[PDB]
Design a protein around this ligand. Structure first.
Ligand SMILES: Cc1ncc(COP(=O)(O)O)c(CNCC(=O)O)c1O
Lengths: 428, 428
């Protein structure tokens, strides 16, 4: 019956929506900095029958019979994570970046203890202390920020905050920050005040894997990440860290926070970690970084600067560009909408001391990983940069038709998932 | 290169383990009561490009652009969940059953407040108050159990416990209880002490959908569930409940507990909920219940009883049989391994006042949903029951090859995922 019928017959509405979403991914230039495109092999793993297996516990130490093969899968993911990042242990079960962070904080601190993280308006993530998230609900929160003049994190200010606040755990990490964190300084501060150091490398983990961003693994007690940003894998989380925290972290993931792990997704993590060690992946990360720098450079040209648009920190060393619109007629929402009309997906971004409401903002976050994965190199990012610069410098009266044509030409020149409609679930 | 190459080329190790796990599911008789076999259409949804979309928020209330198609997907899953279960609201984003429960308790109580659930050694889940789980670490836990003579939950005893303990939230639900809960009595008790009532229907959600188990939705404030047990869907969680809790529950899922939802998995939830309304699904649930009763009856025969093996509560009204091995030379691990050798996959399971260590147990949990999905009916479950009975009554001196041949004949007669090696990711 329906056990073997194709999706198109069982649920035509959902089949049609899958096709529409594939078409949307193909037709747009995706520049949300946290998004990417998974490889075919990760699609296959996530669509595998490993979803049927209950496998609570650890490899070879399960609460269920029949785990012999998913145990090898999980050990491959763990071993590849440790090897790729140079970490002493890995836990590959977190369902997401948020669940990775929930388990780390569960392992390292108790409710009521003090957590120090980067403020949301200064580029932090909601799991770094936002009051409606578990990180704010369970813990006493302190925050550091960026210098208002340079938009860099001032490590003397972070140190002064840590000395006053005496956190149990310091989080280094970000969702919207354009420069390299000083992990050695974070470790020195953590040691000085007796705090644990968590680095949440979700955004830049793929840059780390390719050797293009300093690694937090030498410095941090524990490192959390999403698998699905620059690392380029399926939507899920991952923890690595120093051996002395392995037992606490494993127990915090299960039974502390989760039940059964998603073994099909863990199989895809193993695939993504293997891909992340290849020269092809390293070149993709190189094109990600070069493309972001090309966009930042274009947006610092005099024509854009004279229009009241500026680049936060005067450049970038990562996979994104942060745009400051405080002196522009465009607010973040208006600029996001304008770029959507051209076919480019970005998101608005709060700037520190933002004069506009938090859902409007005076900033943009523009990311390059997804287009680099799609195949864009320096020539294509030069074109993308000029499209964005023309829109932002001119404003809402810009010739959108011409920019849309240019964006469509790029999308057509670099087909996405070409052949997916013929790929099989398993085999070749 | 690697973006479009098949898994078999990118990662032969993982490709081979996918084949081995599929072979294992085909070759064994999978009788873990919390497992099932997802349909082809759910494999396709979970292997879809919807993994690439960040969609924090709710349909029509997203933080990022481009969600016009995943919004319809999520609305279909929500509307089908509400219609199938007769519920006033649904949140379809929980990553797992554990994450569904974490969000419910986040919404309904504060750290330090009192939680009353079924004791783990009496059939309850670790998210109902176990010391190392968030439900035990964040909250003050009380427990009710089963009557020692009948192994039934005594609602007079539950009421006495609630009157003395004064819980903020009462959980009704179980992972290893073989009888039907009295939801009217739980509601009466919750009202008497001013508690919220959460029903965790993870195990019996599919029985409820088919009309073969009383629904908790009329009585409960909120109902949590896994999608992947008797409901037969992809590995994930779901919450439904009364409309006055919709805002608190939605906020507790995001940004309370989670970040971005797994939209590919939510697409599969929509598919599974549609299948769960079909006559084919109801017949599968009917065969699940009849098969479990056949096994329970066979294991209460004198030859099994003489071997020190008994059936908890003297039968079953649900999809599982709980076997008590306290008077048997077999412990739970030994029986799990012996059944594995004859081709039947189960899990050991704790029993009240267990004389054996907790990782070993004095019990077995045997479930029929996966084999019912595979197509087994009363004739096949009669043979399964006799195989299990012979192994448990004879122990280590049983003719393993003779029993393994009988299990293999059943597996060969009911091919599993026949044709999967030819199915496509999308389309046919
Ligand atoms: C009753 C009940 N509630 C929650 C869970 C946890 O779901 P998961 O998706 O594993 O996080 C379970 C799972 N119990 C596993 C089992 O019974 O084998 C559950 O039973």
């Amino acid at each position: 019956g329906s056990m073997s019928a194709p999706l198109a017959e069982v649920d035509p509405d959902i089949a049609e929506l899958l096709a529409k979403e594939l078409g949307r991914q193909r037709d747009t230039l995706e520049m949300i900095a946290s998004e990417n495109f998974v490889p075919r092999a990760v699609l296959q793993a996530q669509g595998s029958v490993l979803t049927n297996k209950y496998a609570e516990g650890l490899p070879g130490r399960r609460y269920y019979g029949g785990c012999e093969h998913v145990d090898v899968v999980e050990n491959l993911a763990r071993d590849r994570a440790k090897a790729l990042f140079g970490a002493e242990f890995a836990n590959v079960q977190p369902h997401s970046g948020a669940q990775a962070n929930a388990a780390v904080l569960h392992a390292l601190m108790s409710p009521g203890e003090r957590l120090l993280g980067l403020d949301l308006a200064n580029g932090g993530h909601l799991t770094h202390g936002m009051r409606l998230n578990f990180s704010g609900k369970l813990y006493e929160n302190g925050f550091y920020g960026v210098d208002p003049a340079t938009h860099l994190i001032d490590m003397d200010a972070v140190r002064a905050t840590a000395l006053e606040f005496r956190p149990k755990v310091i989080i280094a990490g970000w969702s919207a920050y354009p420069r390299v964190l000083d992990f050695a300084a974070f470790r020195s501060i953590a040691d000085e005040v007796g705090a644990k150091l968590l680095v949440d490398m979700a955004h830049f983990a793929g840059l780390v894997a390719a050797g293009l961003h300093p690694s937090p693994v030498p410095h941090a007690d524990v490192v959390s990440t999403t698998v699905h940003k620059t690392l380029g894998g399926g939507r899920s989380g991952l923890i690595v860290g120093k051996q002395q925290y392995a037992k606490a972290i494993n127990s915090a993931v299960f039974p502390g926070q989760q039940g059964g792990p998603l073994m099909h997704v863990i199989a895809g993590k193993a695939v993504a970690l293997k891909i992340a060690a290849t020269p092809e992946f390293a070149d993709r990360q190189r094109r990600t970084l070069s493309g972001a720098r090309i966009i930042a450079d274009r947006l610092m040209a005099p024509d854009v600067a004279k229009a009241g648009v500026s680049v936060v920190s005067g450049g970038t060393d990562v996979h994104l560009v942060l745009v400051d619109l405080r002196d522009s007629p465009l607010d973040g929402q208006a600029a996001e909408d304008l770029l959507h009309e051209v076919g480019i997906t970005v998101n608005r971004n709060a700037v520190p001391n933002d004069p506009r409401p938090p859902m409007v903002t005076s900033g943009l976050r523009i990311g390059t990983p997804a287009l680099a994965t799609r195949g864009f190199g320096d020539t294509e990012f030069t074109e993308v940069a000029d499209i964005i610069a023309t829109a932002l410098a001119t404003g809402s009266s810009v010739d959108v038709s011409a920019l849309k044509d240019r964006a469509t030409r790029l999308a057509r020149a670099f087909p996405l998932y070409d052949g997916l409609e013929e790929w099989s679930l398993v085999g070749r």
